[PDB]
Design an enzyme around this catalytic site. Structure first.
Site, mmCIF file in Angstrom:
data_model
loop_
_atom_site.group_PDB
_atom_site.id
_atom_site.type_symbol
_atom_site.label_atom_id
_atom_site.label_comp_id
_atom_site.label_asym_id
_atom_site.label_seq_id
_atom_site.Cartn_x
_atom_site.Cartn_y
_atom_site.Cartn_z
ATOM 1 N N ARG A 210 45.981 28.337 35.959
ATOM 2 C CA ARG A 210 45.115 29.372 35.363
ATOM 3 C C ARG A 210 44.905 30.507 36.334
ATOM 4 O O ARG A 210 44.414 31.558 35.943
ATOM 5 C CB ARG A 210 43.758 28.809 34.895
ATOM 6 N N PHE B 173 47.049 35.333 51.155
ATOM 7 C CA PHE B 173 45.793 34.763 51.664
ATOM 8 C C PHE B 173 44.589 35.127 50.800
ATOM 9 O O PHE B 173 43.618 34.371 50.704
ATOM 10 C CB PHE B 173 45.557 35.246 53.087
ATOM 11 N N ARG C 220 37.150 26.907 43.261
ATOM 12 C CA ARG C 220 37.373 25.484 43.001
ATOM 13 C C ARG C 220 36.736 24.518 44.017
ATOM 14 O O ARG C 220 36.430 23.378 43.661
ATOM 15 C CB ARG C 220 38.870 25.186 42.849
HETATM 16 C C1 LIG Z 1 31.059 29.274 34.530
HETATM 17 C C2 LIG Z 1 32.480 29.566 34.053
HETATM 18 C C3 LIG Z 1 32.958 28.902 32.928
HETATM 19 C C4 LIG Z 1 34.256 29.112 32.444
HETATM 20 N N1 LIG Z 1 34.651 28.421 31.336
HETATM 21 C C5 LIG Z 1 35.882 28.611 30.836
HETATM 22 C C6 LIG Z 1 36.388 27.894 29.639
HETATM 23 O O1 LIG Z 1 35.664 27.085 29.019
HETATM 24 N N2 LIG Z 1 37.652 28.161 29.221
HETATM 25 C C7 LIG Z 1 38.447 29.048 29.866
HETATM 26 O O2 LIG Z 1 39.594 29.254 29.438
HETATM 27 N N3 LIG Z 1 38.039 29.711 30.973
HETATM 28 C C8 LIG Z 1 36.799 29.559 31.510
HETATM 29 N N4 LIG Z 1 36.375 30.223 32.621
HETATM 30 C C9 LIG Z 1 37.260 31.183 33.300
HETATM 31 C C10 LIG Z 1 38.395 30.479 34.034
HETATM 32 O O3 LIG Z 1 37.877 29.458 34.905
HETATM 33 C C11 LIG Z 1 39.192 31.511 34.820
HETATM 34 O O4 LIG Z 1 39.596 32.563 33.931
HETATM 35 C C12 LIG Z 1 40.439 30.923 35.472
HETATM 36 O O5 LIG Z 1 40.061 29.969 36.467
HETATM 37 C C13 LIG Z 1 41.268 32.012 36.124
HETATM 38 O O6 LIG Z 1 40.548 32.516 37.254
HETATM 39 P P1 LIG Z 1 40.158 34.073 37.330
HETATM 40 O O7 LIG Z 1 39.676 34.443 35.937
HETATM 41 O O8 LIG Z 1 39.227 34.335 38.496
HETATM 42 O O9 LIG Z 1 41.491 34.927 37.555
HETATM 43 P P2 LIG Z 1 42.822 34.637 38.393
HETATM 44 O O10 LIG Z 1 43.932 34.601 37.407
HETATM 45 O O11 LIG Z 1 42.635 33.534 39.396
HETATM 46 O O12 LIG Z 1 42.894 36.018 39.194
HETATM 47 C C14 LIG Z 1 42.106 36.286 40.349
HETATM 48 C C15 LIG Z 1 41.445 37.654 40.194
HETATM 49 O O13 LIG Z 1 42.381 38.695 39.834
HETATM 50 C C16 LIG Z 1 41.838 39.482 38.774
HETATM 51 N N5 LIG Z 1 42.693 39.427 37.548
HETATM 52 C C17 LIG Z 1 43.838 38.708 37.391
HETATM 53 N N6 LIG Z 1 44.378 38.963 36.174
HETATM 54 C C18 LIG Z 1 43.565 39.900 35.573
HETATM 55 C C19 LIG Z 1 43.566 40.571 34.337
HETATM 56 N N7 LIG Z 1 44.533 40.345 33.428
HETATM 57 N N8 LIG Z 1 42.571 41.444 34.029
HETATM 58 C C20 LIG Z 1 41.593 41.708 34.907
HETATM 59 N N9 LIG Z 1 41.548 41.090 36.093
HETATM 60 C C21 LIG Z 1 42.510 40.176 36.450
HETATM 61 C C22 LIG Z 1 40.413 39.050 38.582
HETATM 62 O O14 LIG Z 1 39.631 39.824 39.497
HETATM 63 C C23 LIG Z 1 40.421 37.636 39.074
HETATM 64 O O15 LIG Z 1 39.152 37.275 39.582
HETATM 65 C C24 LIG Z 1 35.114 30.016 33.100
HETATM 66 C C25 LIG Z 1 34.634 30.693 34.241
HETATM 67 C C26 LIG Z 1 33.325 30.466 34.723
HETATM 68 C C27 LIG Z 1 32.822 31.186 35.956
#
Ligand SMILES: Cc1cc2nc3c(=O)[nH]c(=O)nc-3n(C[C@H](O)[C@H](O)[C@H](O)COP(=O)(O)OP(=O)(O)OC[C@H]3O[C@@H](n4cnc5c(N)ncnc54)[C@H](O)[C@@H]3O)c2cc1C
Ligand SMILES: Cc1cc2nc3c(=O)[nH]c(=O)nc-3n(C[C@H](O)[C@H](O)[C@H](O)COP(=O)(O)OP(=O)(O)OC[C@H]3O[C@@H](n4cnc5c(N)ncnc54)[C@H](O)[C@@H]3O)c2cc1C
Ligand SMILES: Cc1cc2nc3c(=O)[nH]c(=O)nc-3n(C[C@H](O)[C@H](O)[C@H](O)COP(=O)(O)OP(=O)(O)OC[C@H]3O[C@@H](n4cnc5c(N)ncnc54)[C@H](O)[C@@H]3O)c2cc1C
Ligand SMILES: Cc1cc2nc3c(=O)[nH]c(=O)nc-3n(C[C@H](O)[C@H](O)[C@H](O)COP(=O)(O)OP(=O)(O)OC[C@H]3O[C@@H](n4cnc5c(N)ncnc54)[C@H](O)[C@@H]3O)c2cc1C
Lengths: 227, 227, 227, 227
Positions: C93, C171, C181
């Protein structure tokens, strides 16, 4: 309980031109947006070429000349149900989508198993068994934080467990997903998901997705290819 | 010729729910989409919490709990004119946007220079000079492939040269752009662009962007901050 | 067959300065690269500030001033084994990683189940059952393209099925993965994977990852937090 | 002051296998990493195919079968000097790179102008003029926060102003950059940058980049193409 694939188009781009731009086109929304972005690059709002004056003709040219970056301005959101966890694992490998997945019994039967009543019964008995084992474990655990007991017992749940997922991407990301997954090479379940997403997007934006050819294969499964 | 900044919101998300989902909300479009994606995660289409039952209240909770990934499903496209090439260089550093830029005389005067008539004249004389040098070079070149002579002569064009750009991103990308650039730290021209984009998006989606505070600074330039 | 988590650091950045740059530092590789990229921004190869002259001190400043983009130049690749398919679904993800996953019996037991011999036996009996059902289905299918029979029978395999994955990221991506995580909120299995990746990266680049605090919780599971 | 393009390879992937994997290969570093990631997908560490047993042969197969995702694990960092701001604007449009740019007089002369002494003098006189105007404005401003006076006066600086940039990306991103920019279509300056980056990467990883053909065109400018 057995569920089938459901793909629903729940969001799309709505376009409105700035009033002070001398330009109009024969279509609304996403495909007008894409044309606008193209003309914005070269200042061709006055349409100097009679060949590529219409939207459909304009978008068709964008394609051949390989300016597919113009497709990135248009967006589509699908709500997908009746998709297994294993197919969802494949779907999330496409990193230019945005996803919201159902936080992890409804199950998805592979069509090759679904088509044989005797295999189907065998499959569903294996599903009941997984579910019996899940409950028997979760109850053993909770006996002796309780989000931790469920997340441990889940370990026993099969690939076939239904997931539900909201998936957003621009038209370029969609075209790439469909190009990789709708081809005959691909895993059957993800191919079906891709074909179905395509079908929805061919309705939504006929010229952007028009070049994709849906064939029914001999096994009754569908496929899509493009030049 | 001197031009001023113009930001126009030319695209946004249009939302329609699947008919077979027992859910309705007090708002349309992008913000309803975001709520839908949230409820899709936890299967809360029936609204069990009286606190977060309304859209505005629901979206406000998403924020505090830091589920900003839900914002990625909603999209907005700006058409920006009256932006210098140097500010556009800063804008394209944000890698989750999609851009279509005017393929490279209208010029953008920095406001600190624009506010002093005598500096402005000095600036514009430097702009005429750049343009005289551009033509004198392009004519020397074409004399003795002709896309190559223009791309060489362009080398002489100033940072202030106007650009025009179509820019698309999801609400999360917008919030991040605005958070980085609308703060007092930032370069003046890109700050103004960010504030203006915010202003448009505060109209389009009041709850998603409501937490951003637009202040006018002492120099009459605007700024935006958020907790 | 039960397997345990294994994380191995298999790749890292090797740095060599251009000879014609008057700059040297007290460290090699990734952390020297990060410092180089910082000094390249401001032309501070001659080290004018006595406070931030050393690598460790330089990198520590980058952090506070929030220039974390400098971290993107340094890369690390992990080879992860003994990770369930469900934890791998969570891992992928994170969209700024690059992955190569084992193309889908070894199984991963959740530690809460592993710690109770009687639950463990119950779990492993459920795993044998899944595997018996897989074979009994695959043999029924192949009886009556044969990549299609295996991909159908897989539908029955549990979340606990072991995966193996090559994962690369810069990094900044690592820090973000670990930040999300390794916190106490997170799912147990993915938390363990994150802590273990951190531990490897704290060895590889002590200053970049030094601010992360590994605590053992009461249940003997580890966690990591940062200001 | 006139400067020329300089591309220096300052970082690359260093690979070390986990000790407990029965696999060895005829090469070190990035290309061994790529092979490792491929074998990790299919568990072919024992090399069952005599055709694709060697690294070079293995990587060549990855290419034809279109598993280019394997290339994402290998990384390269360039330090680029003697590149104009306009070419840097083109370079940063490639969104899977990471950049650290010199925070904005040395200038870059387009080669078509550099090749004619009389045009060159005309060009450099236009550069002196820009610089005179910059100083005359910055002094007028500072007379009557002082980071604001420089950022305003910069508006007058030409496209040709030298930039310096640290650029990191994986081999897949590099291949894509080079594929788009090293082709005859492309702008001359960015084409030269791409060819030069390729040349460095052909030394660093001969098989990954071996399929690219560097030709000198008639005008003495170089180009690169691939099947
Ligand atoms: C309390 C909580 C509950 C959640 N529950 C759920 C759930 O039930 N189901 C579910 O599917 N998800 C859920 N999520 C979200 C999910 O955990 C994250 O979307 C996933 O782990 C990917 O991590 P990330 O969104 O930080 O982005 P990553 O893909 O790890 O990217 C890292 C950073 O790059 C940026 N980024 C990358 N791609 C984009 C883009 N296309 N547009 C804008 N910015 C981008 C963002 O700044 C992001 O923080 C939840 C999140 C939280 C905090
Ligand atoms: C024959 C074949 C076999 C494969 N076998 C396996 C396997 O066994 N295991 C496995 O894990 N994978 C395998 N893959 C790769 C895997 O299917 C893809 O990586 C996955 O579907 C994501 O799709 P994508 O790589 O096109 O990138 P997406 O994430 O869908 O992105 C779309 C495009 O954006 C670009 N892009 C996005 N992120 C980056 C980045 N970080 N760096 C550079 N470019 C980027 C690329 O151009 C990419 O094509 C295989 C691929 C092929 C063709
Ligand atoms: C005080 C300060 C000074 C700076 N000085 C300079 C300078 O002199 N020169 C210079 O070039 N830059 C400099 N930067 C950084 C530069 O401003 C940003 O890199 C640029 O604006 C892009 O924004 P972003 O890095 O947040 O990422 P964006 O591209 O806007 O992406 C948004 C988010 O997605 C994620 N993301 C996107 N791509 C990746 C990726 N490949 N890997 C990991 N995460 C990713 C990150 O979470 C990021 O925050 C400076 C930054 C700060 C705070
Ligand atoms: C003939 C032609 C003319 C053009 N004219 C213009 C012009 O006048 N003005 C202008 O602004 N641009 C123009 N472009 C497009 C512009 O050159 C590219 O957008 C830019 O170089 C970035 O390269 P990229 O689009 O391949 O994506 P990169 O950012 O280099 O990414 C590499 C790959 O990753 C994928 N990717 C990355 N981000 C996304 C995303 N958000 N959504 C979907 N996929 C993604 C795509 O597969 C992409 O190919 C033109 C392109 C062509 C072919």
């Amino acid at each position: 309980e057995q569920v089938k694939l459901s793909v629903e188009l729940i969001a799309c781009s709505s376009f409105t031109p700035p009033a002070d731009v001398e330009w109009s086109t024969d279509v609304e929304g996403a495909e007008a947006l894409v044309e606008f972005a193209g003309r914005a690059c070269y200042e061709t709002f006055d349409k100097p070429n009679p060949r590529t004056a219409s939207n459909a003709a304009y978008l068709r040219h964008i394609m051949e000349v390989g300016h597919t970056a113009l497709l990135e301005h248009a967006n589509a959101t699908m709500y997908i149900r009746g998709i297994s966890r294993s197919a969802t694992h494949e779907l999330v490998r496409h990193r230019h989508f945005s996803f919201s997945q159902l936080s992890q019994s409804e199950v998805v039967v592979p069509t090759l198993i679904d088509e044989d009543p005797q295999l189907r019964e065998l499959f569903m008995h294996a599903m009941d068994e997984s579910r019996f084992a899940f409950n028997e474990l979760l109850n053993a655990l909770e006996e002796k934080r309780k989000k931790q007991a469920r997340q441990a017992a889940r370990a026993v749940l099969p690939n076939a467990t239904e997931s539900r997922i909201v998936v957003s991407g621009n038209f370029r990301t969609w075209r790439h997903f469909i190009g990789m997954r709708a081809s005959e090479h691909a895993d059957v379940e993800i191919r079906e998901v891709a074909v179905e997403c395509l079908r929805k997007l061919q309705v939504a934006a006929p010229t952007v997705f028009g070049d994709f050819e849906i064939e029914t294969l001999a096994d009754g499964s569908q496929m899509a290819t493009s030049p």
